[PDB]
Amino acid sequence: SSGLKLQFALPHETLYSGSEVTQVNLPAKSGRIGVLANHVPTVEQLLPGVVEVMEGSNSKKFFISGGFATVQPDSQLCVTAIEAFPLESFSQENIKNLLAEAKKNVSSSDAREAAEAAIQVEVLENLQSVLK
Amino acid sequence: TNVISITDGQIFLEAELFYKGIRPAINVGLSVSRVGSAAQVKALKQVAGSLKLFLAQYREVAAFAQFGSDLDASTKQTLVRGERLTQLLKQNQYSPLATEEQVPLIYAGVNGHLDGIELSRIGEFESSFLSYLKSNHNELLTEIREKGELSKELLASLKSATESFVATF
Amino acid sequence: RQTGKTAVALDTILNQKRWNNGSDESKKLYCVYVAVGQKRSTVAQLVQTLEQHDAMKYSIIVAATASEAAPLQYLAPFTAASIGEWFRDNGKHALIVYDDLSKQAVAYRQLSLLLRRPPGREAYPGDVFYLHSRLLERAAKLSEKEGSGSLTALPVIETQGGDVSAYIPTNVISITDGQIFLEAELFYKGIRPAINVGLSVSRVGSAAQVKALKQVAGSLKLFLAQYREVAAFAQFGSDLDASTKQTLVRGERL
Amino acid sequence: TNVISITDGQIFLEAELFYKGIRPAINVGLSVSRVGSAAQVKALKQVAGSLKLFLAQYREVAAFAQFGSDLDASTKQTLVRGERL
Amino acid sequence: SAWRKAGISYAAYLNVAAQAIRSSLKTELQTASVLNRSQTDAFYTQYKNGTAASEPTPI
Amino acid sequence: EVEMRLKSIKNIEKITKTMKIVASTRLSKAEKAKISAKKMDEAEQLFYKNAETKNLDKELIVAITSDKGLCGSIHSQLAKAVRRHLNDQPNADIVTIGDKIKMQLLRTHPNNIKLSINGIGKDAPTFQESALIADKLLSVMKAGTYPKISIFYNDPVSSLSFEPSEKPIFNAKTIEQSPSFGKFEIDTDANVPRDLFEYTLANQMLTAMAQGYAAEISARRNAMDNASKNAGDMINRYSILYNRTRQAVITNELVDIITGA
Amino acid sequence: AVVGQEHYDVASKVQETLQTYKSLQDIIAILGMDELSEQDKLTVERARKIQRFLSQPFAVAEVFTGIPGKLVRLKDTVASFKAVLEGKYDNIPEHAFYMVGGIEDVVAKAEKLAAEAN
Amino acid sequence: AVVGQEHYDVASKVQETLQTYKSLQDIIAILGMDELSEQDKLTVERARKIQRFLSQPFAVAEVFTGIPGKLVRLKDTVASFKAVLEGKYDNIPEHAFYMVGGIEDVVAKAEKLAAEAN
Amino acid sequence: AVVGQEHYDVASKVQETLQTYKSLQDIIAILGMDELSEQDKLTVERARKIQRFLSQPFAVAEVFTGIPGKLVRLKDTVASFKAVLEGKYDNIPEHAFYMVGGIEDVVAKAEKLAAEAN
Ligand SMILES: Nc1ncnc2c1ncn2[C@@H]1O[C@H](COP(=O)(O)OP(=O)(O)OP(=O)(O)O)[C@@H](O)[C@H]1O
Ligand SMILES: [Mg+2]
């Protein structure tokens, strides 16, 4: 298709529903891949990272909370997301650090809970990287 | 109660019916005649054999239709028939129709010809069909008012007139 | 019954003391209470309370209790009206509390039936509407040429089972210039003055009202009306947008 | 009203319970006797224990039919007991 | 980290990451929607048709 | 004696009007919440059409109903669907959500039922609850080994009509057997099939529960409107009866007192 | 003793089925049948079928019905009512019990209704 | 001015609670008790407990009740009903308030009910 | 037959428009103006204009506020109401019909509103 269309959606409200995009960053389990036109169909897991939506207007960025980056052979990029990082208002250093310090105490509570706590600390550090 | 018990039947006129727009406002379910059935002109007997039944099921089934869904489509057929029948029976004040220009309307309404025509054009259909019949098929109404009933060939002629006008309508 | 009907009148009598102990006669409001068919001990407690608040000096009590003959109970309102008319025609202002008029109508029923007069609706005499009209129309606001006197009448009619459609209630409500509806369920919910504002009305309206009360009362009555309208949305989450909850809060605090 | 005020109790019978299957059709809610323990065989009394207080049991079983909907196992037990009785 | 064996499933890992973003979201972003997302009052009973009734386990 | 019953019918009419108003508000909220969930559904279901799979993949079946069952034929349609699919395959499980379908599922084979969770649909669809439910379906009931994963829920096709509909979930053991699976450059490091299966289960179950919530609220609104008009008719008839009764009784005392003379 | 034990039981059960409908009328009228229990639904639909089946054409009022009058013997009607009470005929539409005689007439009417009407 | 301010307050509060309970009787009965707010419910259970707490044994009612009569003094009643009003005794089931004397008898009845309930 | 065909027509259209507007008032109060279709919005706005235009200054209310009462003839009334009905006066605001008699007065009030606006 002409360029690439992005179906970036969030359960509270969809962000994009096929908007034309000049380039998409997709931080994944392996690594970020730039898809902008045609490309090949792909299925991939979106690791929490900055899914920056580069466009002719501006290269606005979004840190994802997780999702799947999948591609269809008709130049379709279905990116399902949960919580985004609107511009830079999402940035809040103090409460992020407070959660990281207060809950790393329970990072060794109980197998599943401990692992989820460690993962949440890791994604908080990802946000800290996005905090800049 | 006592004046009904002394009479030979009653014709009930309902106020909310009058308010809606049904002008005769006659409650078919309540209104009844005890001995007029034997006296009714046989032509109306033939054409209007099942109008009472039709209005009946249109009554109870409509009382069942409290929602705008698919129902059963046989119930929907009954509603789409009963609406045309009810709108057919309206008249105006000081405009008494005679039997010869009455019977064909009942025949059209009982043969299902009315189903295609929209509700807003039902009275339009009445007037136009009357003009059409008195224009070309004058012999039909002349015979139904002279002889007093409908023969099988007369029924066929009336049917043919109905489909002839319905296609043009 | 047991709604607080006499309490409103008594509070009025006490409130009049602020000016009854002054000097300006145009502000003094003399009070006369009418006891029709009431228990004598009730009258005793009543008068005791009047002296306790030092309202006895400007108050007159005519007492036709249940023990006296029915004709006396029939005449007590008229003699009280004449007593008030004395003040009214002498240029002063007087307040008259007819209290129980249903018992007076019952007494007239007894009189008429015992005199073989033709009965009527629930055996009431004919000229009871005429009777109450004569009694109530005597209260008036005299013009300046006659002395600018005044008589304000506060009849108290008790209704059985809330039936305001009963014959005597229908007669008296037609006579009077506005009504004060008192309900028992309102009394039970905690609203101690049980005046049902949605039903109570005043024909004179705000014309005979303090100007500040006039300024502050239109918003009050509008808010009460809105609160009654939105009262149904209270027994649940009751969000139904900010408007409904704001009206609920305002009306309930009012 | 006069006869209910003149007698030493009453035995209410209504057609609704009669058509419900109850052949005696005794409305135990209203059917009351001004004499209880007195004028009663002792075998149908405190020795049987509950024959002092089935009146309360049949009042409560009617008192939780649908408005007093079954909450826990006690309610289900009382329901079964009452309907069996 | 490890969310399959050490954790429970990808669903739990993703939910914890979403709760991370929501709870660590800035003050002006906090609204009724994020409160509803944080709000959870489910009770897992796991009807004992044969056995193993969870008895309203909290979410 | 008629007056108290007339007052009760007045109160019923007021209750029905208030309930239909709050049902309209809840319908608006549910629709604006469900649009995004429907977007999530389609964005992956139309992609799953590319890799059709649609194969045979003892069975785990989920049912979606609301906790509140005041009205509507929602639970009746869910019950007929579950009974039909249960008699078709008696070995399938009867996993449910909510409570109303649970109480409805006592007199029809109450042993294949495994999971029971209530208190779900009363305020909003939400996402955390769906994620927790999917996670403990995977961890405890090992949903990946069950061939067909059918989810019972009502489609809000119209603003007033609804019917049950089905959305199957391909197992991780068979999403890798898709005929179009080759065109995706998968990596064995990220174990994409099972993660895809779990994410798929979560998304479709969330969308199904949101749609069921919306349909149930719409049906409740319609039922409250119907009860409103029925109460109005009852009010009219009993007002007529009360007026006749009061006139008749007052005639009675007047004629009695006339005969007294 | 007089009419027979079977007839007494049949009449009693018919009375119960019809009286449950009247008892639940108030709930049905305002809320609807969907707010009832499964047993209540079964009883109310059986009651509707019964009370529609009590109707019978008359040989005098055929002009007001259009159906020739019919007569049913006691042994036939008690058996038909007991058969309906047992639940042998619950898939039959309720309309099939209107202006009929024995249960065989109900079966025939249901056959016609499913044939051309539906 | 006679019974004391506290007694008047307790009486007014219990009366308004019974008022609120009987005002909601329609909602509870025909619609259902599950569609109420938390405060509405809590008031409902409190008022039910109070109304069955108003029942007292009568010395001349042994022929009917079979329970020995109880005479509860004024301040005892006032304190017990104040405690019930505040909410100190909300955990006790309603049946322990039925046919009893003071709140001490209510506590004894609740404990004994737990006893034979095992 | 009495008031004339045109008078009956305009009166019937006015009353049915008011009835439809009243029926839509509920959902207007709930959401507002968006939920209505283009013809629904047109009918609602036209009926609001008609409701405002029903008002007429009173010659006995001259001393009351300020407004010159007008003896609007019935022919002028029917002409004005049918002119508003036809739908050529939608751009005139609703308040230009309030406290206004003949339709030329509506036009004049709209002109003075425009003059005091810009
Ligand atoms: N403002 C008030 N504050 C407190 N109690 C009040 C108030 N008004 C009325 N009551 C009480 O309400 C009850 C009935 O009121 P009250 O006897 O004063 O008037 P009433 O309705 O005219 O009486 P009745 O019908 O018995 O003649 C009494 O117990 C009284 O104490
Ligand atoms: Mg008093």
Side-chain angles (χ1 to χ4, degrees), chain C residues 185 187-190 192 234-236, chain H residues 8 15-16 19 22 35-37 40:
Chain C
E185 69 281 17
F187 178 79
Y188 300 144
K189 284 173 291 273
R192 183 40 47 81
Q235 61 274 14
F236 58 95
Chain H
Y8 181 81
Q15 190 174 5
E16 55 85 15
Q19 169 62 35
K22 65 90 175 179
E35 52 257 54
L36 278 297
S37 69
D40 291 349

Coordinates of all heavy atoms in Angstrom, one line a residue, chain C residues 185 187-190 192 234-236, chain H residues 8 15-16 19 22 35-37 40:
Chain C
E185 N -45.8 11.9 57.9 CA -44.6 11.3 57.4 C -43.4 12.2 57.4 O -42.3 11.9 57.7 CB -44.8 10.7 56.0 CG -45.0 11.7 54.9 CD -46.5 12.2 54.9 OE1 -47.2 12.1 55.9 OE2 -46.9 12.8 53.9
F187 N -43.1 14.6 59.6 CA -42.8 14.7 61.0 C -41.9 13.5 61.4 O -40.9 13.6 62.2 CB -44.0 14.7 61.8 CG -43.8 14.7 63.3 CD1 -43.4 15.9 64.0 CD2 -43.9 13.5 64.1 CE1 -43.2 15.9 65.3 CE2 -43.7 13.5 65.4 CZ -43.3 14.7 66.1
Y188 N -42.2 12.3 60.8 CA -41.4 11.1 61.1 C -40.0 11.1 60.5 O -39.1 10.7 61.1 CB -42.1 9.9 60.7 CG -43.5 9.7 61.4 CD1 -44.6 9.1 60.7 CD2 -43.7 10.0 62.7 CE1 -45.8 8.9 61.3 CE2 -44.9 9.8 63.3 CZ -45.9 9.2 62.6 OH -47.2 9.0 63.2
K189 N -39.9 11.7 59.3 CA -38.5 11.7 58.7 C -37.6 12.6 59.4 O -36.3 12.5 59.2 CB -38.6 12.2 57.2 CG -39.1 11.1 56.2 CD -39.3 11.7 54.8 CE -40.4 12.6 54.8 NZ -41.7 11.9 54.5
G190 N -38.0 13.4 60.3 CA -37.2 14.3 61.1 C -37.4 15.8 60.8 O -37.0 16.6 61.6
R192 N -39.0 18.7 61.6 CA -39.9 18.9 62.8 C -41.0 19.9 62.5 O -42.1 19.6 62.9 CB -39.0 19.3 64.0 CG -39.7 19.5 65.3 CD -40.8 18.4 65.5 NE -40.3 17.1 65.3 CZ -39.5 16.4 66.1 NH1 -39.2 16.8 67.3 NH2 -39.1 15.2 65.7
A234 N -31.9 9.5 44.5 CA -31.2 9.7 45.8 C -30.8 8.3 46.4 O -29.8 8.3 47.1 CB -32.0 10.5 46.8
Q235 N -31.6 7.3 46.2 CA -31.4 6.0 46.8 C -30.4 5.1 46.1 O -30.4 3.9 46.4 CB -32.7 5.3 47.0 CG -33.4 5.0 45.7 CD -34.3 6.1 45.2 OE1 -34.1 7.3 45.6 NE2 -35.1 5.9 44.2
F236 N -29.5 5.6 45.3 CA -28.5 4.9 44.6 C -27.3 5.7 44.3 O -27.1 6.7 44.9 CB -29.1 4.3 43.3 CG -29.7 5.3 42.3 CD1 -28.9 5.8 41.3 CD2 -31.0 5.8 42.4 CE1 -29.4 6.7 40.4 CE2 -31.5 6.7 41.6 CZ -30.7 7.2 40.6
Chain H
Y8 N -34.5 11.9 74.3 CA -35.2 12.5 73.2 C -34.5 12.2 71.9 O -35.1 11.9 70.9 CB -35.4 14.0 73.4 CG -36.2 14.7 72.3 CD1 -37.6 14.6 72.2 CD2 -35.5 15.4 71.4 CE1 -38.2 15.3 71.2 CE2 -36.2 16.0 70.3 CZ -37.5 16.0 70.3 OH -38.2 16.6 69.3
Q15 N -37.0 6.6 65.6 CA -38.2 6.8 64.9 C -37.9 7.1 63.4 O -38.6 6.6 62.5 CB -39.0 7.9 65.6 CG -40.4 8.1 65.0 CD -41.2 9.1 65.9 OE1 -40.7 9.8 66.8 NE2 -42.5 9.3 65.5
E16 N -36.9 8.0 63.2 CA -36.6 8.3 61.8 C -36.0 7.1 61.1 O -36.2 7.0 59.8 CB -35.7 9.5 61.7 CG -34.4 9.4 62.5 CD -33.3 8.8 61.7 OE1 -33.4 8.6 60.5 OE2 -32.3 8.4 62.3
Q19 N -38.9 5.1 60.1 CA -39.5 5.9 59.0 C -38.8 5.6 57.6 O -39.5 5.2 56.6 CB -39.5 7.4 59.3 CG -39.8 8.3 58.1 CD -41.2 8.1 57.6 OE1 -42.1 7.8 58.3 NE2 -41.4 8.2 56.3
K22 N -39.6 1.9 56.5 CA -40.9 1.7 55.9 C -41.0 2.4 54.6 O -41.8 2.0 53.7 CB -42.0 2.0 56.9 CG -42.1 3.5 57.3 CD -43.1 4.2 56.3 CE -43.4 5.6 56.7 NZ -44.3 6.3 55.8
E35 N -30.5 -3.7 44.8 CA -30.3 -2.5 44.0 C -30.4 -1.3 44.9 O -30.8 -0.2 44.5 CB -31.4 -2.4 42.9 CG -32.8 -2.6 43.4 CD -33.4 -3.9 43.1 OE1 -32.7 -4.9 43.4 OE2 -34.5 -4.0 42.5
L36 N -29.9 -1.4 46.1 CA -29.9 -0.3 47.1 C -28.4 0.2 47.3 O -27.5 -0.6 47.1 CB -30.5 -0.7 48.4 CG -32.0 -0.7 48.6 CD1 -32.6 0.8 48.4 CD2 -32.7 -1.6 47.6
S37 N -28.3 1.4 47.8 CA -27.0 1.9 48.2 C -26.6 1.3 49.5 O -27.4 0.7 50.2 CB -27.0 3.4 48.3 OG -27.8 3.8 49.4
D40 N -28.4 2.7 52.4 CA -29.8 2.3 52.5 C -29.8 0.9 53.0 O -30.7 0.6 53.9 CB -30.4 2.3 51.1 CG -30.6 3.7 50.5 OD1 -30.5 4.7 51.3 OD2 -30.9 3.8 49.3

